[PDB]
C-alpha cells in the first residue's frame, strides 16, 4: 500500500492534476473581482473552490504521509501546507488565500531553480542588509527628533520617518515633496538629506556590484 | 531569368536603393506631421507615398519570388511582408504604418547584428518573466480585492491594479500618489507595497546580473 | 598592571558588555520620539543614559591607554572617541549623539568588513568625482546666470542651482517640475538640459562599471 | 628662439601658472552670481577677466605656434583654441563662456585619463544609440499623429512627441503626468507606452550590459 500510494504521489501525473487544479484555480481566483461575473456564477464558483481545497487537502494529506519527517524540513512542501491550511480556515485573511497560486512555482521545477537561485544570493548579502537597516534607523530617529514638530505627516513619529526614509532612498519625490517644503521652513535640512542620498544610493551600488561578483565567481572556477 | 532575377535582388545596389526610399519615406512621414506642410504640399506627398509603396510592394513580390519556402522561415522577411501588406490596406491603421521605418532596420546589417543580439538573450530570462507575471497577478488580484472600493481608479478592476503594480515598480508617484492617499484610508498598505517594491526590485536586480552572465559566459571561455 | 588591563580591554567580554550596552542605548534613542514614553519615564531613561555615558568614557579612557599612538592613528577608535567626545558635552548638537548608534558597527567584525570594503573603493573613483563636481559647477554657473532672474526659486543663487542640478540628475520631476516651466518662459532650456541629462546620467553609468571591474580585477587573479 | 620657446611651452612650470589662471578665474566666475559681490568689485572683477584672457590668448599663440600641425589635429588644444576663440569675441555668448573651466580639465592629466576612457567607450554604442534614435523618431510620429490634436502640449508636434518619449523613457511622471490624463480621454494608450516602456528600458539596460563587456575584455585577456 505504501508502495502504491507512493508511487502515485511521486508520479508525474498526480502534480500535473494538481497543476491544472492550480490552473483553473488561478483562473477562478482572477474572475471573481468582477462584480458582473459573480452575480451570474456564484454558486459555481464556490462549488468549484470547495471541490479544489478538498482535493488538495487531501494531497496535503497524502504528501504528509510519504514523507513525515521530509515535508517539515522541506521549505517547499512547508510552504504548500502553510499556504493550505490558511486557506482552510473560514470566517480579512481571504486576501492572502490568494498566496496559493504561488503553489505554480512549487509545482513547476523551473520556477523552483529560478526561486533557489535567488534566495542563494541573500547570504551574501545578509550584512549589507543589516548594515542599512541600523543606518535607516540611525537616520530615522534623526529625522523624527529634528522634523518630527513642524512636519509630524512625514516625520512625526519613528515609524513615519523610517517611511519616508525609504521613499527619499528609491528617490521618488524626494526634494520637490520633501526636501523643499522642509527649506521653506528648515533651511539647513539638505546637509542631512544629500549625504543621506549619497550614502544610501552608493551603498545600494556596493550591493548589486556586491551580488554581481558572487554570482559570477561561482561560474568563473 | 531566375539567374538575372536573383542577382538583381541580392544585389547590393537593390537593397541600397530600397534603402534611399526607406530614408526618404521616413522624412515624408517625419513631414506630414505639419498642418502648414500637408497644407503645402498634399498631392506631393500621396504620389510619393503611391510610388514608393508601389516598389516597395513590387520589391516584396520579387523577393517572395527568389525564396519562397525561406521568405515564411526567415523573420526579417517575415516582419517587411507583414509591414509591407499592413501599408497596404486603406481605409485607425495608418499610425501602424509608420513600423515601415523598422525595415530601415532590415536593411542595413550593423542594426540586423544588433537587434539579433538583444532576441538571443530573453531565451536566458524567459523564466524570471513568467515568474514576475505571476507575481504581478497574484498581488494585483490582491490590490484590487483591497483598494478596489474605496479607490476604483487604481483597483476598481484588475487591469488598473495590474497597471499600479507596474507603475510602482517603474518607482513613479508610489508613495505620494498611492501609498500615502491609501493610508489616509487604509492605514496598513505599506504592508502591502513595502514587500512588493522590495520583492519587484530584488527581482528586476537579478534579472539583469543574470543577463550579465549569460552575456559575458558567451565571452569568458 | 599594565597586563591585566589590556588583557580586559582586548579580551572578548569587555567589547561585548560594550556592545549590549550600544544595544540598550539604541534601543532607548529609539524611544525617547514618543511624547508619551517621555512623560512616562523621563527619569529613569536620563539615568540610564548618564550610566552609560559613563561606562563608554571610562572604556574611552582604557582603550586610549592601552595604545595610545594607535588610538589617534586608528581610524575606528578614531571614530569612537569622536563620538563619545561628542556627547560627552551639554547645552542642537542632541540630533548627532545619535551617531554613536554607528559604534556598533565598530563593535562587530562584519560590519567592519564591509565598512572597510566600501571605503577600499573609493580611491578608484575620486577622479571620476572630481570631475562631476566640477562638471556640475560649471553647468550651476550657466543656470544661475541664464534662469536665476526669472525663476530665483531653483536657480537665483549658486547653491539653488546645485541643488536643481543634483536633483535633475537623480531625475526627479526633472521635466514636470524644472524643465517644462522654464520652457513656458524659456522655450530653449532643453538645449541646456537634455545634453546635462544625458551626460550625467552617461557619467553615472561608467562610474559604476568602474567600480564592478576594480572590484572584480582582485578576484579574477 | 624655437628651443628656449618650446622648452617654455612644454615645461612644466607654464601650464602650472596657467593652471593657477585657470582656478582663480573659475573662482572669479562663481562669484559673479552674487549681486552684491558685483556691485562691490565690478572694475576689480573685470580688469582680472581682461589680464587672464590676455594671458590664455597668447598661450594659446605659443601652442599653436609650437605644434601648428599638431594644434588643429589634436582634440584637446582643439577644444583649448574653441573655447578662448569663443570667449575672446564680445557683444548670450557669456554663458558659454563659462565652457572655459573645462580648461582645467584639459591640463590635468588625470581628468584627461578620464575623459579619454570616457571617449573610447562610444564606438562600442554608436549602433544602440542610432537604433534607439530611430526608435525615438518611429514611436514620436506614432505619439503626435495619436495624441497632438487632444493633448497638443505633449505631443502637438513632433518635438514634443521626442520630449515626453525621452521623459517616459527616463520614468518620470511617465503614468500619473502622461499616460493617465491620457487615459481620461484615450482609454487604450498603455498599448503605446507600456510596450515603449518595456522596449526602452530593456535596450537601456542593453546598453550598460555592452559597455560593461566592452571595458572588462580589455582586462580579461
Ligand atoms: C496573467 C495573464 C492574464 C491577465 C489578464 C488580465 C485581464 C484584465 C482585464 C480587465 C478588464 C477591465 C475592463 C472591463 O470593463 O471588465 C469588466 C469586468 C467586470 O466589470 P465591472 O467593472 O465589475 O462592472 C460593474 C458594473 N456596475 C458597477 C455598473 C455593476 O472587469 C473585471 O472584473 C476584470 C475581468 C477579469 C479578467 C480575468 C482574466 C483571467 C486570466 C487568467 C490568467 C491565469
Ligand atoms: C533579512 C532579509 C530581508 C530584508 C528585507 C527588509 C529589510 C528592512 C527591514 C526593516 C525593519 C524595520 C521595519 C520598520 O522599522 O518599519 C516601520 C514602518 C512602520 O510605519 P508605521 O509607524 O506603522 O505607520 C503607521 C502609522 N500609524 C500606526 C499611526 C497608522 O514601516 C516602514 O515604513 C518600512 C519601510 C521600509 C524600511 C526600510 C528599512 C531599511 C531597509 C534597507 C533594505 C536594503 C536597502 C538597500
Ligand atoms: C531623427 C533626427 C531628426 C529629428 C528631427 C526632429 C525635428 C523636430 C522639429 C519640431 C519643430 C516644432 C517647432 C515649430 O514651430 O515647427 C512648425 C512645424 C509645423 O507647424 P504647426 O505647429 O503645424 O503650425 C500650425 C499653425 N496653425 C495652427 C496656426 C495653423 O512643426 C512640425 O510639424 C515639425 C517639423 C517637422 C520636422 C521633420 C524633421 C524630419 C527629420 C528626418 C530625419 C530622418
Ligand atoms: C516592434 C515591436 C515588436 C514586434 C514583433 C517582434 C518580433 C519580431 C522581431 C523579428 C526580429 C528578428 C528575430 C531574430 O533576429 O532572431 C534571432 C535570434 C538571435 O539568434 P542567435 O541566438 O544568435 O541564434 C541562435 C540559433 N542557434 C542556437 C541555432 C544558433 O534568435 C532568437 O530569436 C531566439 C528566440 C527568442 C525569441 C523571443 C523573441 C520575442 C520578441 C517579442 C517582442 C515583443 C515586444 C513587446
Ligand atoms: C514574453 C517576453 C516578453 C514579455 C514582456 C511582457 C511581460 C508582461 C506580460 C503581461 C501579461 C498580462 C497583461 C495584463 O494583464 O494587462 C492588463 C492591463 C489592462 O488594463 P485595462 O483593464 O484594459 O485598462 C483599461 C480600462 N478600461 C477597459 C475600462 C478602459 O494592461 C496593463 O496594465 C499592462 C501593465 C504591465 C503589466 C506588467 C505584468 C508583469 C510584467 C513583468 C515584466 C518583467 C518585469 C521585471
Ligand atoms: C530596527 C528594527 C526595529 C524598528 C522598529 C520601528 C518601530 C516604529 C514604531 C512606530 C509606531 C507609531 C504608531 C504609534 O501610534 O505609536 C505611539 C508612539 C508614541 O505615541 P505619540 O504619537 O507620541 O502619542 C502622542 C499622543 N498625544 C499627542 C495626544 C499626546 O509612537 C512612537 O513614538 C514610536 C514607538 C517607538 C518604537 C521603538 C522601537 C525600538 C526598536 C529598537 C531596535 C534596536
Ligand atoms: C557617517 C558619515 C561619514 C562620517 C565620516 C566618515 C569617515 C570616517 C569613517 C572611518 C571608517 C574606517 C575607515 C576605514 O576602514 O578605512 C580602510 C580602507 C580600506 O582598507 P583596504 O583598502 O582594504 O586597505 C588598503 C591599505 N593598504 C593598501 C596599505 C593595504 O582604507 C581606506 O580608507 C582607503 C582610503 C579611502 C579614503 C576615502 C574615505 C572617505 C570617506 C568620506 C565619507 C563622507 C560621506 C559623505
Ligand atoms: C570626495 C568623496 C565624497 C564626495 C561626495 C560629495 C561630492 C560632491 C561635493 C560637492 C561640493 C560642493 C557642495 C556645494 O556646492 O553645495 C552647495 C549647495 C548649498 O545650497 P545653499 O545655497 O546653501 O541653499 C541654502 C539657501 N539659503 C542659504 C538662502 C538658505 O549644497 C547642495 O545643493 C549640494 C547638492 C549636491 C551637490 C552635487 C555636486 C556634484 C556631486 C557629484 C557626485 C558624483 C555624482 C555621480
Ligand atoms: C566647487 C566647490 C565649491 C562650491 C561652492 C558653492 C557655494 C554656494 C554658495 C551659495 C550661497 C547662497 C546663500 C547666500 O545668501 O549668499 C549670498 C550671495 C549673494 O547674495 P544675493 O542673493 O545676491 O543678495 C541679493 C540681496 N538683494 C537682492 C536684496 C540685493 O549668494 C551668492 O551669490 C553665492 C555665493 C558665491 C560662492 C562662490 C564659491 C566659489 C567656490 C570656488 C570653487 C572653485
Ligand atoms: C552620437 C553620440 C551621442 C548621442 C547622444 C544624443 C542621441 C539622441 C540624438 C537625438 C537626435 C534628434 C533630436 C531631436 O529630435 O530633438 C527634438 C526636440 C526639439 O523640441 P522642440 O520641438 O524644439 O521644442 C520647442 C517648441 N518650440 C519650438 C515651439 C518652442 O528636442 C528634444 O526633445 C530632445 C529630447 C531627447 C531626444 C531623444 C532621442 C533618442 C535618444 C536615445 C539616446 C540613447 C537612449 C538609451
Ligand atoms: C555571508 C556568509 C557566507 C558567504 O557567502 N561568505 C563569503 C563572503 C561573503 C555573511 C554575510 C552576512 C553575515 C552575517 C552577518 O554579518 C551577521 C552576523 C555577525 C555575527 O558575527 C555572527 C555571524 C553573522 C550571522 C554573519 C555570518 C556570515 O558572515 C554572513 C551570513
Ligand atoms: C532557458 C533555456 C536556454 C538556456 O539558456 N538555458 C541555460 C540556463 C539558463 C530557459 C528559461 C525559461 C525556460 C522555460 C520556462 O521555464 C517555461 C517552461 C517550463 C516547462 O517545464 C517547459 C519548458 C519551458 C518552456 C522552459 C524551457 C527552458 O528551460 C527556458 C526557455
Ligand atoms: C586612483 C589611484 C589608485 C588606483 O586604484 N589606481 C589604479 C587606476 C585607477 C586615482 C583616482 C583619483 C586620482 C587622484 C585625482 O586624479 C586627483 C589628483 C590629480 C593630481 O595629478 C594629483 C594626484 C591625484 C590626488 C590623483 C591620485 C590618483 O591617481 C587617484 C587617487
Ligand atoms: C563599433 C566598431 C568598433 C568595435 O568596437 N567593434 C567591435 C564590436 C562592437 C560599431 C558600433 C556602431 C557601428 C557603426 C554603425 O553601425 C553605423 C554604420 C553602419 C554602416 O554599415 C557603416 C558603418 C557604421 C559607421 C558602423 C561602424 C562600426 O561597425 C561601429 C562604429
Ligand atoms: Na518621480
Ligand atoms: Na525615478
Known sequence: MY???????????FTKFI?????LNGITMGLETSKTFMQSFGVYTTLFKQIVITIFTIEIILRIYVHRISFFKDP???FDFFVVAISLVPTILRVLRVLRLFRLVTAVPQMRKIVSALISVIPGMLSVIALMTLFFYIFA????????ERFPEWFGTLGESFYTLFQVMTGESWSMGIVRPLMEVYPYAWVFFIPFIFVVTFVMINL?????????????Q
Open 19 to 23: 497543476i491544472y487544479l492550480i490552473v
Open 208 to 220: 548589486v556590484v556586491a551580488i554581481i561578483v558572487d554570482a559570477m565567481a561561482i561560474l568563473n
Open 141 to 148: 530617529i534623526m529625522a523624527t527628533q529634528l522634523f518630527g
Open 76 to 78: 517547499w512542501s512547508l
Open 3 to 13: 508502495l502504491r500510494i507512493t508511487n502515485i504521489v511521486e508520479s508525474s501525473f
